[PDB]
Nucleic acid binder design. Sequence first.
RNA 1: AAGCUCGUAUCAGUUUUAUGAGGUAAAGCGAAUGAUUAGAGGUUCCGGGGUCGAAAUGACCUUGACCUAUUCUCAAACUUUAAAUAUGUAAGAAGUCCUUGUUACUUAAUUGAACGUGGACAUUUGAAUGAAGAGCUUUUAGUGGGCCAUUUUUGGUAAGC
RNA 2: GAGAACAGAAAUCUCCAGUAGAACAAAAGGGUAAAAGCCCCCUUGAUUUUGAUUUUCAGUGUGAAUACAAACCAUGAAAGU
RNA 3: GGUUGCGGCCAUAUCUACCAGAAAGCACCGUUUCCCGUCCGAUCAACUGUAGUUAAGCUGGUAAGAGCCUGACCGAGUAGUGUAGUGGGUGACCAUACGCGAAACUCAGGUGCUGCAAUCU
Lengths: 164, 49, 54, 251, 61
Amino acid sequence: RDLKIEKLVLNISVGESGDRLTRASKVLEQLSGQTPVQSKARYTVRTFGIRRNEKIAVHVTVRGPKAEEILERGLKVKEYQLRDRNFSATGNFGFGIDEHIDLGIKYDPSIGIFGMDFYVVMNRPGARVTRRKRCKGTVGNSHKTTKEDTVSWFKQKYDADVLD
Amino acid sequence: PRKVLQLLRLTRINSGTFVKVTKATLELLKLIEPYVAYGYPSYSTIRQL
Amino acid sequence: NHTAHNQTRKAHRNGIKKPKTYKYPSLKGVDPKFRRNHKHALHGTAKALAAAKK
Amino acid sequence: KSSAYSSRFQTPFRRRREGKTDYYQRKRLVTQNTPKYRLVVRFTNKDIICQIISSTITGDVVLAAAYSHELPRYGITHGLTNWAAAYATGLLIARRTLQKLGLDPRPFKVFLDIGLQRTTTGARVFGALKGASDGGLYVPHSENRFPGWDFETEEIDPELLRSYIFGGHVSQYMEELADDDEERFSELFKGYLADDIDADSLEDIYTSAHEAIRADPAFKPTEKKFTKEQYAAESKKYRQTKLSKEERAAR
Amino acid sequence: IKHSKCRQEFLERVKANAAKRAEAKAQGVAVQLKRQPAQPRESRIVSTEGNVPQTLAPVPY
RNA sequence: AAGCUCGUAUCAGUUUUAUGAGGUAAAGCGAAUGAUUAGAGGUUCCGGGGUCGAAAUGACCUUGACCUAUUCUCAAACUUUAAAUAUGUAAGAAGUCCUUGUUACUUAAUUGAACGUGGACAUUUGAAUGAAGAGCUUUUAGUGGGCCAUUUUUGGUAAGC
RNA sequence: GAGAACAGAAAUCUCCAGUAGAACAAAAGGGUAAAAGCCCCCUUGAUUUUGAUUUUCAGUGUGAAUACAAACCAUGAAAGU
RNA sequence: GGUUGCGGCCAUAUCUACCAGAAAGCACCGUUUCCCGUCCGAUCAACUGUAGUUAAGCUGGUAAGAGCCUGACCGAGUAGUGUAGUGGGUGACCAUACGCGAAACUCAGGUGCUGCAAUCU
């Protein structure tokens, strides 16, 4: 019962649709190598400059061995140092970065500079029992991960100090 | 009760018939009880009626 | 305006009777696919009772 | 969760909680004094289950059942779960259930149940459909979901539908790993090489297998191991038992 | 949208009327197949050797 | 009122046995739902109307969008539970059982389904009591201002309202 | 409820709990959880011929509704609807 | 007796928490050529049962647990209610006579039973 990464979600929130949405859409497209799916807004606030169903944000998920090289080259920007809390009670963690030239790219005055959210989810093998269709089940108490199990896993590999 | 009084053939005032006592006829008398007076007759009154 | 005073007593003068439940109910209203066969069923069973059984 | 909450919600059905059955699909299947027969095709890992089942309020009645594991009696010992063994299984019950009725008088008709397998074309589910239809069962169906169906036009390819019957996608795949990466090719298909059955010889095994199924459907069972009771006596060891009253009162 | 019990109970009671009549045809005996209502009970000697009847005296309040 | 076909027919302002239906009185609030007199401020968390406007960085006015963080008391328009009285059907001849006859409906199938021929089953022939005949058909008269009491109720303080 | 650059009471993303506390054009009451809700795919059965039946009732009309028959089609792999 | 497929009544079957499971069966798991489906072979599709596990699933046991099901000369013949009087009370209401008769509660034990087919020391 190891502690493999399930997936990696790369979120970018921009309050407007248009060119800036589509130019931010290319950034995840050339990095994840996959077409990023867009996201429409639920309801309207008008202080944020939004309206109902405006296609406000793009994101993309990466699964498998490609996500880890995206994660490590991303986590290097934070210098193998996350903050104190940052961990869900479920067992997951995320972190956001400014300046996506820190993972390196040409400056691209058409495209520009954007800030991304990285987020990681963790599970053990046997998580298919919740995700399948016939005979759906729940994860047992000892197999549900913990907040603590992510801490020892994140301290052991990537050689990092968690912090604080 | 007026339907039940007609089923025991008790039309006019001061009239009488003999009633076999089961579960069924005991509930009929239980309806018309503020109108009739009944008891258990001996051989003497049956011979004299 | 409206009342039902003395209406139950008027119904029980000539009584309240039943629809007197005939033999052979009227097949008007039955599913027609049953009616269309049942015509041809009787047309045969009157023949064999007349031809054979005599 | 409060004590009022557990008092309030009613459970689903027993066969509904353990999520094996859709009742919305079932209430369309059952209610059609004629017994209404149903073909039940299920797929596990490493086995194929095909049953002819009627409907009864006592709960069900099974006429005929054939599985994947009866196929090594018939010459198929490797790849028991592919599209072809799914085809031979649907050919198997179609011969088997037709013999006991004395048919092999319009056709005999049996409806196809699936369960919770999703409807995608080229599935392995409809292999038992095509095997049942070729066997002689009147299974009403359309040629939409058979493999070799074009999404562009209304054309079915009979040259490629025939190919999946004799394991064409397996016999072609044995060739693509023949020239690329033996380390992959020794890892999979290992029972094929240990019996030394290559790609082109696979088709003749299936062809001989359809001839034996039409010849021999009469299902002699496995003879058995020890008894009924010997299997029941050994099973009494591993299970626990209930607890008496005074032992829990002393606790 | 229903189904009825009481009639199906009558349909079982006709079967009882067949077997009693068929048995009583064999061994010459009365049938008595009509139902009866409840009847007043008979005389029975009751012995107060086990339990002495206790007085009540309706005092309480 | 005129009658007509028949004559213990089969029925009944009733009870029993069997078996359904209901959400009232009583219960419940530490089981779901839970009003009520009451109310300070919160200017793209909105603006709901209104009048203005050669327009909209657009003004003027009024309910406010919110209870923002709270507190007590409930029931006809609140409920798990559920009487009494009232209420639907059944208690056999147009029935049960056997053998097998029909068809274009139905079944994989002469398997069903419906109606039958033939045969067996009688006054305790299928609970109580009653039946001053039962049944059907015409034809027309008056009437279509009602009131009172016991009990349950609604509006109304109240009433011969 | 626990987390994620700008980012807070309110955008977006991720898991856990979650018996309907949501939604179903609108009053109120019913009804609904692999649906009757959400999002996609295909479509005109919102069609022809007239009868049978329920509620309001004189067992008249009008409105609305229910179950079928004979036709022609829609959809689905299919039972069906 | 253990498991599996399809179910019947639909909590005595649920919820929470720990602990066991011989064999076989299921399941997790391996890979992406093809049909196929997606932002992502995760879900689904196809392929092998070969590379590995009983850690979850599943089944079973445990707890003066919560819930839930029957039972009771338990509450109680109490509340309520049909009928009767030229009965009482100024009333509001309450006795009596012939009948019918609950519920919350309290206590007691209980915690799935079973249909067809196939298969396992």
